[PDB]
């Protein structure tokens, strides 16, 4: 059974045993939009739950447009050219318009990344700046939620007369789905906010997980925080496995987002009849699989269909390596995941990116992990609570020998962009 797993910029061609392997779990077919940019134009004229963007923008003196950073494969020019043309038609000059990269707590985008994200012409024609989550002085305090999270949001967005956000609706291991409100919290929120919102009091709950909005405390809270900042207009898209846009939603930050989620829920779920002992997955290739930090998403994404004590085999290119210095420091400070969890469950201290180690700890309570990558040497991966294995085919052979002849293999080529589920019926 030959399959191409997502892997860096290339894919990875794997051959899995026919007798042991279930049919691959894939996004359901939906027709790509032939001309998604023209659809964005139409949706800006007739949006969901808001005035047309042209009428909203007229008389506004300044605009701030939130865009995702490199880790999200948003086809930004498709969304931005319509927005920028409408703002021009509304009378805003280009100098009135700021594009703000909603990094969350990620490192800033590089000059080359801005070109990759936005296109060269857009990137040199409008001001493009990065959010810095550890610079509290660049944020404005908006209040504290009923659950005690202070809302600190980037001042360039707070001060803008017209607030716009763009993004991509995909499953997310903490917030259920990306998009909508998440461009604000945490996209332009300070560590003072994010350290609490990404704390164990949120992440240890079972529905802080892929595909859950209802019942997910993470989503309740980032929606509440985004409502405190406000957002006048969003444009969000969904993408199929080949990265073609399959839907566009525009308008009210909540109503448009929920319509996009309703769409993605019709295609993202891939069901199996029972969990299996071996799950082969990816980190969705470039650009998500740049770091081990992000590749944890492939591991959490596989959890619903792995049996307790099973093995997840993941392939990810890891072209940028492990991730932030702070994320890397946690492995040095806590040799075992149990000890790491004891430390963070005390709430005495907060470290940038600790939330992803908390998610890796959740994976490792349920499953072994075999990790296939050339971006990081085996000795380095072995210190990150995964077993480096030279090839996916070898890793699967090893797991099948360990579990015995009844074991089955599932495979998820697009990794965390699929929502695998067990349907016992
Ligand atoms: C979601 S919890 C999230 C977390 C971070 C952290 O650093 S923590 C960063 N981001 C970035 O915010 C933008 C919007 O997120 P979405 O999940 O794509 O809707 C995007 O640039 C993310 O990289 C998000
Ligand atoms: Ni986050």
Author numbering: 2 to 426
Sentences from the paper on this structure:
The LarA family consists of diverse racemases/epimerases that interconvert the diastereomers of a variety of α-hydroxyacids by using a nickel-pincer nucleotide (NPN) cofactor. According to this hidden redox reaction mechanism, the hydrogen atom on Cα of lactate is transferred as a hydride to the NPN cofactor and then, after a rotation of the acetyl group of the pyruvate intermediate, the hydride returns to Cα to complete racemization.
To address this problem, we applied a heating-cooling treatment to promote ligand exchange. In this step, the increased dynamics of the protein at the elevated temperature leads to the opening of the active site to the solvent, allowing the release of the bound D-lactate and the binding of the alternative substrate to the active site. In the cooling step, the temperature was changed rapidly to 4 °C in a thermal cycler, followed by incubation on ice to lock the conformation in the most stable state. The two D-substrates adopt the same orientation as D-lactate and interact with the same set of residues in the active site. In both structures, the amide group in the side chain of Gln357 in Conformation A moves away from the substrate by approximately 0.4 Å, and Conformation B leaves more space to accommodate the substrates with a larger Cα substituent. This result indicates that Gln357 exclusively confers the plasticity of the active site. The geometry and the hydrophobic nature of the substrate binding pocket defined by these residues, as well as the flexibility of Gln357, explained the negative correlation between the size and polarity of the Cα substituents and the reactivity of the substrates.
